[PDB]
Amino acid sequence: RADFIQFGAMIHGVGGTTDGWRHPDVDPSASTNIEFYMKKAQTAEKGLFSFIFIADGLFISEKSIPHFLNRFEPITILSALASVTKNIGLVGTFSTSFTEPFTISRQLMSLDHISGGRAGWNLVTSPQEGAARNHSKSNLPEHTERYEIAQEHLDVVRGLWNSWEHDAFIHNKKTGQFFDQAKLHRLNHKGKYFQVEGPLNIGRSKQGEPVVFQAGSSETGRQFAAKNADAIFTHSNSLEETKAFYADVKSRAADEGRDPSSVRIFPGISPIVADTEEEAEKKYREFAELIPIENAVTEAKARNLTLREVAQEMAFPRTLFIGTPERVASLIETWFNAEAADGFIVGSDIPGTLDAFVEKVIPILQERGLYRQDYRGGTLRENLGLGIPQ
Amino acid sequence: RADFIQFGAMIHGVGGTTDGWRHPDVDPSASTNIEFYMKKAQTAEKGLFSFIFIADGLFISEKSIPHFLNRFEPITILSALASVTKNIGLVGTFSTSFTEPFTISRQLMSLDHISGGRAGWNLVTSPQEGAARNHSKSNLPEHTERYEIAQEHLDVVRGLWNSWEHDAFIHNKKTGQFFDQAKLHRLNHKGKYFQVEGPLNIGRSKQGEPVVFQAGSSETGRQFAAKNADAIFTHSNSLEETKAFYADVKSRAADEGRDPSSVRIFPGISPIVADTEEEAEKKYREFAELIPIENAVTEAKARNLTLREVAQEMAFPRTLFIGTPERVASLIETWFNAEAADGFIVGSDIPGTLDAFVEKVIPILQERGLYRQDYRGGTLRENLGLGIPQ
């Protein structure tokens, strides 16, 4: 293809499972360990990853997975990581359901100034139902209303980001003109869900404004993303399903009046890379064996599997993206050439995974001309190949 | 006195005036300049300052001072500064009027984990009236109600911070016990203004929880601070007024059942330090002369002052804390020994001011045994001489 493949790294502390933290190599304090986050972010930057991504949640119980129980909040960890990284994007999850757009707008834009234009927002419309009860609401609005709220929220945030024109700040010491009064704009927004006068108290960043990510899978969500998002997350359950998703969203984007290339689609994968097929499989099995068989308590596949093995694989499915660097690189290239992906969000809970990917897979993709030799620029937009709106 | 004096540094970009930015030495981009903030924070740390402080505002107009127009948001800048500093406190202004306690609670605690226990919250009950209209409210509640809201908000934030006991996270890989279920507590809070179930999704920091600062000057505000705050900001309009404030708040604290020494009082000063009286005065005058005389348009003092000089001094009053290091150190010691202060929040808008203070005043106070030779610890509580509640 004309373009290069891009990667993001999801940094997810102790990981997305119930028992992975029990592995010898895992630091069970990882989710609130600043060194862990800094090291992963710097590994990702070593591999020229376009961004890091911090997922989020707003409600837990005593059955929540260990990572969810005790973890960094996204804007704070991303701002901290901004000071110890150079070119890599900083993408954080924030919901439209509870926080005022003025607040979100400022925090994201402030990160964008701190980072020299590397901020991104993963916009979540539909948090857990319990989250409502952590934010002085009896319940969440219904699905349709959540997307209506999210549109207005987004509209306010982007309107606030355009309070100041990019060249509004003249800073003329002689005349005493600090800014050009014609280049300041009040939002004066009076909507159903939000009323926000403006102006915002921070101007344009080096990439204009933060990039917006979205992960909608429903018909409503796909359409919302197609209309609004710069980049879209999705799953990698099968090449077929992901191809279809890709084509459908790109088509919806065209229907909304947009150039499909301005919407970048990133399926999520968690690859297990080793020097041989056997080593890779051994790593997988070591993690799959961490679950107490107990959840045998929790599909025609003749691979001579025992009940134990079947139980373990249901608890922790084996990725397709497992094996040698050559295999993993080839699969990635195939998904790319098949238009199932513009890039991938790489998960790396198994220790060594990100490092192995950066050290072994990236050079193959470079050699084949599918991945750049260095960063294109210092902003997220530039590295994703997006334009600055303004 | 038994204790040492403590200092905080307010980092305030281009400063608190209309025209100070016009000085040759001032960088008019300072308010969104990450290098400016990092350098000031590291200067303050060089002087063993107990904390840095970031003020905040939530509403502007075209007549707002230049700093207010375009500036960093507090949680983001403080998190960024956490990664490039070691021992210095990180105190940020957040209002109780708009944001949900769950959000504030998480962001502050997350900063506290990122920083190894250096977070502080300057709690603002009463933002500008226009701020309401940036947050989907027609108007702010009245004074009394604002303090009632703020009490419940604070109560929820502190209750959420105590969701997890300090030793809740067993991390036992053998048994698979990640946490002790008896050491997790749901808030189940159902109040007039907030309804928050909990639990919070982040545990105790290295200082237990963030330190709370407050600046109430009204009778209600003084009482709220006396009841709730670890540290209190106030002005330095006169030694007499500040002594009275100090005594009154410490007495209110006692009335609330507290040990007065657990409430640390910090008047604000903006000292102008130079090698001679003349140099110091020249620096002041250079800044006072930046205002367009025009605000002659905007008190018995026979210092042979011209109308120009009178106009200029009204626009930018001369601090008492002006002159030689010896003078400034002596004034500070006097205010300390007079029980007008447990420490000072030092403003430093005039370039070189913080550096001159750290380089010239601090060693005098060290020599006299009023200031420590190094940091007491790596947490804010330790450096302020406060205990960890838990």
Identify the closest residue of chain B to A174 by CA–CA distance: B22
Query: Beta A189-190 vs A195-196: how paired, if at all?
Result: antiparallel
CA angle A44, A34, B379 (to 5 degrees): 155
* Helix H or strand E encompassing B10: strand B6-10
Q: State the Cα–Cα distance between residues B298 and B34, nearest whole angstrom.
A: 35
Spatial contact of A213 and A8, defined as CB atoms under 8 Å apart: no
Token output for A350: 């198994």
Whole-number Å distance between alpha carbons of A164 and A186: 9
Q: Please state, in angstroms and as integers, the Cα–Cα distance from residue A345 to each residue in A51, A364, B236, following that order.
A: 9, 18, 54
Distance CA A223, CA B362 (A): 61
Find residue A92's DSSP bridge partners. Answer: A54, A121
Given an 8 Å threshold on Cβ–Cβ distance, is B62 in contact with A181?
yes
Q: Are strands A322-323 and B211-214 parallel, antiparallel or unpaired?
A: unpaired
Residue B242: both structure tokens together: 């500040």
Q: Is A360 helix (H, G, I), strand (E, B) or coil?
A: helix
Q: For residue B306, what are its two tokens?
A: 């011209």
Measured distance between the N- and C-terminal CA atoms of chain B, rounded to whole angstroms: 29
Q: CA B290 to CA B25: how far, in whole Å?
A: 12
Nearest to B25, CA basis, from B359, B385, B354, B365: B354
Q: Is A195 left (phi over 0), alpha (psi -120 to 50) or beta?
A: beta
DSSP 8-state class, residue A68: H
What are the φ and ψ backbone dihedral angles of B146, each rounded to 5 degrees? -55, -40
- Taking alpha carbons only, the member of A5, A6, A4, A22 closest to residue A14 is A22
Buried b (16+ CB within 10 A) or exposed e, B312-338: bbebbeebbbbbbbebbbbbbbebbee
CB A320 within 8 A of CB A284: no
Binding residues of B for FMN: 56, 93, 143, 147, 217-218
Q: Which amino acid is at A230?
A: D
Q: Do B203 and A32 touch (CB under 8 A)?
A: yes
Q: Which residues pair with A122 in a beta bridge?
A: A93, A213
Under a CB-based contact definition with an 8 Å cutoff, are residues A321 and A347 in contact? no
- Which of B70, B197, B203 shows the shortest C-beta gap to A203? B70
Min Cα–Cα distance to chain A from B11, Å: 15
Rg from Cα positions in chain A:
22
Contact check, Cβ <8 Å, A100/B98: yes
**Cα distance between residue A118 and residue B327, in whole Å:** 47
User: What is the spatial distance between Cα B23 and Cα B27, in angstroms, rounded to a whole number?
Assistant: 9
Can you say whether the dihedral through the CA atoms of A326, A329, A332, A333 is positive or negative? negative
Question: From the candidates A21, A31, A36, A76, which should be mutated to test the interface with B, based on the most B CB atoms within 10 A?
Answer: A76
**Could you tell me the resolution of this structure in angstroms?**
2.1
Q: Which one of A62, A134, A179 has the shortest CB-CB distance to B69?
A: A179
Give phi and psi for B208, each to the nearest 5.
Answer: 80, -75
Which structural technique was applied? Answer: X-ray
Judge whether B225 and B214 are in contact, CB under 8 Å. Answer: yes
Phi-psi region of A116 (alpha: psi -120 to 50; beta: other; left: phi over 0): left
Nearest 5°: the CA angle B265, B117, A15 is 155
Domains of chain B: 1-390 (3.20.20.30)
Cα–Cα dist A156/A194, whole Å: 8
3-state secondary structure of B147: helix
Residue B282, helix vs strand vs coil = helix
**Residues in chain B closer than 8 A to A28 (CB atoms):** 169, 171, 173, 178
Q: After which residues is chain A broken (C to N over 2.5 A)?
A: 298
Residue B186 · residue B198 · CB < 8 Å: yes
Breaks (C-N over 2.5 A) in chain B follow: 298
Structural contact between residues A258 and A288, judged by C-beta atoms closer than 8 angstroms: no
| Distance separating the N- and C-terminal Cα atoms of chain A | 29
Tokens of A35: 């060194």
Angle between helices B101-114 and B143-161 (to 10 degrees): 50
Hunting for tokens 């003078």 — which residue is that? B327
Backbone φ and ψ for A265, nearest 5 degrees, come out as: -105, 125
Taking alpha carbons only, the member of A251, A147, A216, A183 closest to residue A390 is A183
Check residue A15 and give left, alpha or beta (phi > 0: left; psi -120 to 50: alpha): left
Q: Compute φ and ψ for B119, nearest 5 degrees.
A: -80, 145
Q: Most A CBs within 10 Å: which of B178, B184, B293, as the mutation test of the A interface?
A: B178
CB atoms within 10 A of CB A364: 18
What DSSP assignment string belongs to B95-120?
Answer: ESSSS-HHHHHHHHHHHHHHTTS-EE
Alpha helix segments (H runs only) across chain A: 34-46, 66-69, 74-82, 101-114, 129-132, 143-161, 219-228, 239-255, 277-288, 307-315, 325-337, 353-356, 362-367, 380-384
B15 vs B29: CA distance, rounded Å: 11
Q: Quick one: closest CA in B to A61, which residue?
A: B199
Q: How many residues does chain B have?
A: 390
CB B125 within 8 A of CB B154: no
Binding positions of B? 56, 93, 143, 147, 217-218
Contact assessment for residue A13 and residue A350, using Cβ atoms and an 8 Å cutoff: no
- Reported as half-sphere exposure (CB side, CA atoms, 13 A), residue B84 has a value of 25
